[PDB]
């Protein structure tokens, strides 16, 4: 039985696409899906030259990931899936970037206690967040970016997807990913003549 | 309908060697057509080994052979050259060239192409067709899978039989999906070859 371990920050549009893909895969393949939290804010800590404006666009970027960690600590890893879905629908599908509102709405949607929102503005969960992030994102390259998935235990950057594959198409892309994971002496495949629009 | 692999190679390149031998393994277990095209490590180095400082020789001979006898001769000429360089570790390139032309059944006079710029434009045109990228510059190996250009699969060993076939099926799946861009291992990197 194949296993997808996926690290996400609700803010990340790449994570959003790749996680929606994995959920499509799960509809047409027998796989175990484990979500884990990582943090774009932590990625950004490790970059001394980040421009002021980009820092400003991330002013309160710890809130959603703190709440996700706190939810997992309180209720188990199982609640990450639906909490992430509720948050990401609002952030990515509705374009809502008032994160305080996204957090309270998403907890209610997911059926989780409202008090979890208080995690967003406390450092109590940061040690756990850092450890979760490092487990997922530690890589040997200076690329260090999202999306990162482990396929049957094999850590990858990508698949970098700019649209969510659906149904059996999603399944076939999973099958291909598993085949590459199964061959230890494969390292990289990348399109050269086109790139994702951002 | 028929799956097609276009493969850009410099006889000197170990990564081209591995990925091209993989494609020839694929051809034994999947119905595919394989087309070889020349590129040049020396050109990559312009736009940026013991025995190999004269790095234009093998690629110049390859291009000259294609110009005179057609691109189909590149498969056996490359096999001849790379068998010697990579499988036998022969780095005397003048000897590799002579021997490989004889292996492939091509005229010995083609060896003279190694030390003439007569087809360097043809070489450059072939190179850029294979190596051009919209993003950051890429290295070897580059291929087209059913018309879709990829860097990689970067492979450090040659998959054989159905294992090779499954890796092709995977590549074809990724090529077929327009909105897939990259998959890369994060905890191991290719060996220093
Ligand atoms: Mg976890
Ligand atoms: Mg500003
Ligand atoms: Mg504290
Ligand atoms: Mg050609």
From Swiss-Prot, chain B:
Q: Tell me yes or no: is Oxidoreductase among this UniProt entry's keywords.
A: yes
Q: Does the keyword Cell membrane apply?
A: no
SUPFAM superfamilies xrefs = Thioredoxin-like
Show the GO cellular component annotation of the record: cytoplasm; peptidoglycan-based cell wall
What organism, scientifically named, is this protein from?
Answer: Mycobacterium tuberculosis (strain ATCC 25618 / H37Rv)
Q: Which GO terms describe its molecular function?
A: oxidoreductase activity
Q: What does this protein do?
A: In vitro, the reduced form of Rv2466c catalyzes the reduction and activation of TP053, which is a thienopyrimidine derivative drug that can kill both replicating and non-replicating M.tuberculosis.
Report the superkingdom from the record. Answer: Bacteria
Impact noted for substituting residue 22 to S: Lack of activity. Confers resistance to TP053
Q: Where in the cell is it found?
A: Cytoplasm
Keyword terms, alphabetized: Cytoplasm, Oxidoreductase
Protein's recorded name: Thioredoxin-like reductase Rv2466c
Which InterPro entries would you find in this protein's record?
A: Rv2466c-like (IPR053977), Thioredoxin-like_sf (IPR036249)
Assembly and partners are described as: Homodimer.
Main location class: cytoplasm
